[PDB]
Write a protein that binds this DNA or RNA. Structure first.
Ligand SMILES: [Mg+2]
Lengths: 470, 254
RNA sequence: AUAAUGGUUUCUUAGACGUCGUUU
DNA sequence: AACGACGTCTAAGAAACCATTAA
């Protein structure tokens, strides 16, 4: 035929692993039925908790805590949400409330500072108020901070982010932090908010809510991303960083570095030279060697948004040994293609369009170096209602899914491995309560850490984990 | 197995074209085109290139300026389109003007992309009826153009965006339906109106809309045939194109 | 900032080209 | 032909705000 493209294929679905090694594609359903992965080792044996609220906002924290303890039912979405049985029932670990010595109140001058509109001053005051709790580091695990809407003036402006500023300021002091706004309290559907906050608190107390199954030990996955800062003298400071995800021995590692290791100083195109790429990949190699036992990664899956130059390709090829294969796939979001599902001959009617969009996890090879991957689509087996109707997560936003495009710069063979790895990495995010994300977790973590680093120029150079920015 | 994936790409079969080249910057040529507004297409390269009629060039350029006019044979159109961006735009305009000839379809440009808008005055046509069934709810028919509530002096119609792309030595034409809002400077005020319009355009509704737009743009589908179109068939420098009708599709490996 | 991504409008970067020059 | 310095075309992204809540 004049218009018959190459044959397409599907990679079925990532399978999450839960306590006692139970496989389940549904995150919330598996959490409610089985237990979290970390409960097998009882690593977070008790999720202690502390408060940080303005002069009169303690009641909201108490109310959200009580809602976390008590069960809830889904209201808005019903084909995906599962009934929330309360923290103790689902996660098998209490949420012992803070005592009188852990329910601190912020300084009354915080509102006075927010009246003028100084974001840095307010962040410094919040951190100074927090500083009194560093003595009792064994008395609580996760601190809860409530940001009232009356501070909305000092929330986001002229490239400033209070969230990233305080997440970077607190990071040297090893203490996970969770921010709750009026959005979580006001949102009509409470089951979703309860599920999200419960998963966030459990994961930031040191636990592992879930982890993917059928993961090869001797693999590495790296992703780079950049952020733009406009200077006074017409400059375009581009700050890049990298994030790797490690299966380790029995845990889960999600770390993120900074490229500015006394080098780079780009102030220009979001591209790095031979020296910068070699230095950046040296840290990734060292961390993979250290987390494992004297071994190198048998594969590398470095990804980013922009395209690799020839010097970048050479640096990537030379930063690793000759026994490892490096794929340098580039992910492109904006595309002019889209697809529609057509069903075959069933019964007696001819071919007709389906009532639901095309299957998620379907890829189409256009050329020998480009392909289309469907990170959005219809998922089967996630329907809490009648178990024959597929689920489309973004049906309330887009009537049809928008495919992503993969442009390979190295490697060979089919697209099975790259597409399967990307789709598997889309489901491992713990900050989101939905089924998946459009992009793999490496790109999203690199992007958020790039924003965090760009926010604070004087960020200390040791490597942080996911739980401190999630 | 028979699961099918249907794209929005139609193939282009022509491989080489003939055009006029005039032998004597881009900004001055664009300015001259804007002022003259002739019945021809022009572009700037190592030599100024055009498609149309000689009198149009005579109006554009003074008689003492045109040293010569010759015939340029752009063989391997896909490679040349991929190599240069000006040739991409020139082929865009040529194939589009060949496409929208002798049809009651408007033409508008926003953000350097081309649309095919349905006219208000010519809404109730026989060809414009199959699109009204797909837009319509259940067995009812849908309004293909009209006004937007709580929006004084602001209209809307059904449009399709037409693009061209090169992938692996082949040329494809991209079709994608939106709603066109007139005037252009106040498109944002109808954003919600667009969303509520496309909230329930699922797989089958979008499939039918695409099929209707293909029928409107070409006039015949099926049989594994192709449509021949012509741009400026009234001069020595003419464009002849051959476009397939069946959209690019794929089947499972089994 | 429990969260998902759909729009809108700017800006930047990178390629491709051209034009005096300019250096020599 | 010496290396800038300045204009077009395209393809891609990032801030910075709006919106509703899965046939
Ligand atoms: Mg968080």
């Amino acid at each position: 035929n004049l218009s018959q493209l190459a044959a397409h294929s599907t990679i079925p679905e990532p399978l999450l692993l839960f306590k006692d090694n139970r496989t389940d594609t549904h995150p919330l359903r598996g959490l409610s039925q089985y237990g979290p992965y970390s409960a097998c080792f009882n690593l977070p044996g008790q999720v202690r908790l502390a408060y940080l609220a303005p002069t009169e906002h303690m009641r909201k924290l108490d109310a959200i805590v009580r809602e976390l303890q008590n069960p809830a039912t889904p209201k808005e979405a019903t084909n995906y949400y599962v009934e929330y049985g309360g923290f103790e029932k689902v996660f098998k670990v209490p949420l012992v409330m803070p005592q009188e010595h852990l329910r601190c109140l912020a300084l009354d001058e915080c509102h006075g500072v927010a009246a003028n509109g100084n974001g840095l001053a307010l962040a410094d005051k919040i951190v100074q108020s927090m500083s009194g709790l560093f003595r009792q580091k064994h008395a609580f695990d996760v601190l809860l901070v409530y940001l009232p809407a009356s501070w909305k003036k000092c929330f986001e402006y002229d490239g400033f982010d209070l969230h990233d500023r305080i997440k970077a300021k607190v990071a040297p002091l090893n203490l996970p932090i969770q921010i709750i706004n009026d959005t979580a309290l006001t949102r009509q559907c409470r089951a979703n908010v309860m599920w999200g906050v419960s998963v966030a608190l459990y994961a930031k107390a040191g636990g592992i809510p879930w982890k993917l199954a059928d993961w090869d030990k001797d693999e590495a996955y790296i992703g780079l991303s950049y952020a733009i800062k406009k200077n006074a003298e017409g400059q375009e400071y581009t700050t890049c960083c990298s994030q790797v995800f490690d299966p380790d021995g029995t845990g889960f590692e999600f770390v993120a570095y900074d490229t500015r290791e006394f080098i780079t100083d780009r102030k220009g195109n979001p591209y790095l030279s031979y020296q910068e790429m070699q230095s950046v990949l040296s840290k990734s190699l060292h961390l993979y060697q250290s987390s494992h036992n004297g071994r190198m990664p048998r594969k590398i899956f470095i990804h980013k948004t922009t395209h690799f130059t020839e010097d970048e390709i050479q640096g990537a090829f030379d930063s690793f040994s000759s026994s490892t294969e490096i794929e340098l796939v580039q992910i492109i979001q904006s595309t002019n293609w889209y697809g529609l599902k057509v069903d075959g001959k069933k019964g007696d009617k001819p071919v007709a369009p389906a009532s639901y969009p095309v299957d998620r996890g379907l890829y189409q090879p256009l050329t020998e170096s480009e392909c289309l991957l469907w990170t959005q689509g219809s998922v089967m087996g996630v329907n809490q209602q009648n178990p024959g109707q597929p689920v489309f997560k973004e049906a309330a936003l887009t009537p049809l899914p928008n495919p992503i495009m993969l442009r390979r710069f190295s490697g060979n063979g089919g697209w099975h491995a790259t597409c399967s790895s990307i789709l598997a990495l889309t489901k491992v995010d713990w900050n989101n309560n939905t089924l998946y994300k459009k992009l793999p977790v490496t790109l999203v973590y690199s992007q958020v850490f790039a924003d965090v680093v760009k926010q604070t120029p004087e960020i200390v150079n040791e490597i942080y984990d996911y739980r401190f920015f999630m | 197995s028979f699961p099918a994936l249907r794209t929005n790409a139609l193939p282009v079969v022509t491989q080489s074209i003939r055009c006029g080249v005039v032998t004597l910057t881009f900004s001055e040529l664009k300015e001259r085109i804007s002022q003259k507004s002739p019945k021809a297409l022009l572009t700037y390269t190592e030599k100024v290139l055009f498609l149309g009629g000689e009198p149009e060039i005579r109006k554009i350029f003074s008689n003492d300026e045109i040293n010569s006019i010759g015939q340029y044979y752009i063989d391997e159109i896909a490679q040349s389109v991929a190599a240069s961006t000006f040739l991409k735009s020139f082929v865009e305009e040529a194939i589009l003007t060949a496409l929208l000839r002798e049809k009651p379809i408007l033409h508008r440009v926003r953000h350097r992309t081309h649309y095919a808008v349905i006219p208000n005055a010519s809404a109730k046509d026989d060809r414009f009826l199959d699109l009204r069934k797909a837009v319509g709810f259940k067995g009812d028919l849908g309004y293909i153009t009209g006004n937007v509530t709580n929006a004084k002096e602001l209209s809307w119609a059904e449009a399709v965006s037409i693009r061209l792309e090169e992938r692996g030595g082949k040329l494809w034409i991209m079709l994608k339906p939106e709603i066109w809002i007139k005037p252009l400077d106040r498109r944002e005020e109808a954003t919600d109106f667009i969303r509520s319009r496309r909230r329930y355009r699922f797989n089958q509704c979008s499939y039918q809309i695409l099929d209707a737009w293909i029928k409107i743009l070409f006039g015949s589908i099926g049989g594994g045939g192709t449509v021949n179109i012509s741009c400026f068939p009234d001069a020595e420098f003419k464009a002849e194109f051959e476009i397939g009708t069946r959209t690019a599709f794929s089947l499972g490996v089994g």
